[PDB]
Amino acid sequence: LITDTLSPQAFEEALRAKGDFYHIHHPYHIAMHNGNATREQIQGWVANRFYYQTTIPLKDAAIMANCPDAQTRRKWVQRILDHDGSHGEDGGIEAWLRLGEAVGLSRDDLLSERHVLPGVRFAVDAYLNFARRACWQEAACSSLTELFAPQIHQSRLDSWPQHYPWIKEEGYFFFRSRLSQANRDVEHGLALAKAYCDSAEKQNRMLEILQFKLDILWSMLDAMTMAYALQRPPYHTVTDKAAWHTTRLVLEHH
Amino acid sequence: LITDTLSPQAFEEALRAKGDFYHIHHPYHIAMHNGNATREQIQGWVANRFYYQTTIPLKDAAIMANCPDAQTRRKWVQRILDHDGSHGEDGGIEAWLRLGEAVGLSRDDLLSERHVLPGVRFAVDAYLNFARRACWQEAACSSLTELFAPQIHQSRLDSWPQHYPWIKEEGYFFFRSRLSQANRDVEHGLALAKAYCDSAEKQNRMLEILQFKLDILWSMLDAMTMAYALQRPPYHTVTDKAAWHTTRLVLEHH
Numbered sequence A, B: 001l002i003t004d005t006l007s008p009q010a011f012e013e014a015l016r017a018k019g020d021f022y023h024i025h026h027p028y029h030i031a032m033h034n035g036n037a038t039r040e041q042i043q044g045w046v047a048n049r050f051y052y053q054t055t056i057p058l059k060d061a062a063i064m065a066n067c068p069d070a071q072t073r074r075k076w077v078q079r080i081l082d083h084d085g086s087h088g089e090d091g092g093i094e095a096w097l098r099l100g101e102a103v104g105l106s107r108d109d110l111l112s113e114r115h116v117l118p119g120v121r122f123a124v125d126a127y128l129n130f131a132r133r134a135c136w137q138e139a140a141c142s143s144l145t146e147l148f149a150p151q152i153h154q155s156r157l158d159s160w161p162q163h164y165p166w167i168k169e170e171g172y173f174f175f176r177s178r179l180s181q182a183n184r185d186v187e188h189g190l191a192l193a194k195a196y197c198d199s200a201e202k203q204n205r206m207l208e209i210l211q212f213k214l215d216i217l218w219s220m221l222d223a224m225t226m227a228y229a230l231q232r233p234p235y236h237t238v239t240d241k242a243a244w245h246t247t248r249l250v251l252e253h254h
């Protein structure tokens, strides 16, 4: 715990130290990196991570709605454009659908969101609800797990082709695009964090907010582990079919 | 799937059939019932389920905030009284703390909420968030897993004394109190559902809301299983200490 307020430069390094808990250290990721994941595990990861990807623009729009500073909104909106496309070009959500196709899943497999597990849904929804309710500065700075993302994207680019040569080349476009996007994103996030977190109280709170974000990522992979590695998906004692709910209940009627 | 609107009696039958997916069928519950859970597994369950218990009055207050009908509010507030108590350590939250003491945990172990796993937190927070955002009728009716609760309370009253004689008597007061309270609650909840859900569209929607509620309960137990049965609590690959966030971030500073 911080007792005497860190300088902006020392505070940046305390945020970066949270990378010790990044999801690159989760066994599910480690198995994929080492070549020990199954195709079913890879497909399940791609289908479930699509729910996070399609939530990113929702959460960034939520931050914008709570942010009365036009300067900050002019920069932040680029995140929405990167994922949704500008306009019919493509964008990150389309690139994720192409990763789906590269691992053998149809566009409808991903777009239906029928394979998204409830533990993934509750973790990703927690991110959106924080973004809706927290002050904009706190919600914007919870993006800063992006500090650690280029390293994980590059790890996949380096390892997957050797172990999983059946994954089509087009599939890798998203990970390569993020090497530059995540870097520009954090150039903004860090400036915000270092300006805003100017007391020991705000610095400790922000570190706890970043821990919450890391917990979301870890918990998504825990749900995937139960379902696809341990043959304990929801209701496995009662049925062999998927029985969980499949609807963003507060955003869509059915 | 319902095509032609069910009668109120047939709709009740449809709600009751969802009991097939109730958490009495989860392996973590089954192990406790059969006498095969460890003292640590039982203590972890009591500490984590306290986060659900302390959220119930928050959720019920959220329902009331969204309910412009005074008649309904006059009935619903009794749920808040039941958990918070009319006076003194009276109430269900205090009874759960006494269950904590009966299994060997202090009041601070529970009140600090330091043992609450992120997967339990995100599932339970999903409940609260639905109650804050959905229409009051739908949020109220998501209580209807109470249809199945007296049986699970009775299962513990029947099995635990013999398997776990070290659990102190006073521990069993909460489960016994809920045999009557859950029945009083569902009298109202089922009357509301049968009156409100008077079209095929509303009936289909409500069965999906009840499934969402079932999925929350199942996912809480999946998180406990990872941490306490499978030796895979968060961050186990990089630390032996608890490193998850421990704060209701949007409701308390820290």
Ligand SMILES: O=C(O)c1cc(C(=O)O)c2c(n1)C(=O)C(=O)c1cc(C(=O)O)[nH]c1-2
Binding pocket: A056, A092, A142, A143, A144, A145, A146, A148, A149, A152, A153, A178
């Ligand atoms: O593949 C990954 O492991 C990973 C992790 C994260 C993260 O650290 O939050 C993001 C992404 N990918 C990603 O593709 C993405 O567009 C993204 C946006 C954000 C954010 O919080 O706004 N995180 C991440």
Ligand SMILES: O=C(O)c1cc(C(=O)O)c2c(n1)C(=O)C(=O)c1cc(C(=O)O)[nH]c1-2
Binding pocket: B056, B092, B142, B143, B144, B145, B146, B148, B149, B152, B153, B178
């Ligand atoms: O011990 C159990 O398995 C169990 C289950 C549930 C449930 O079915 O939602 C409740 C409770 N307990 C409980 O003690 C309680 O006070 C309660 C209120 C509610 C509700 O949704 O408002 N559910 C439950």
Ligand SMILES: [Cl-]
Binding pocket: A146, A149, A150, A178, A182
């Ligand atoms: Cl990224």
Ligand SMILES: [Cl-]
Binding pocket: B146, B149, B150, B178, B182
């Ligand atoms: Cl109950």
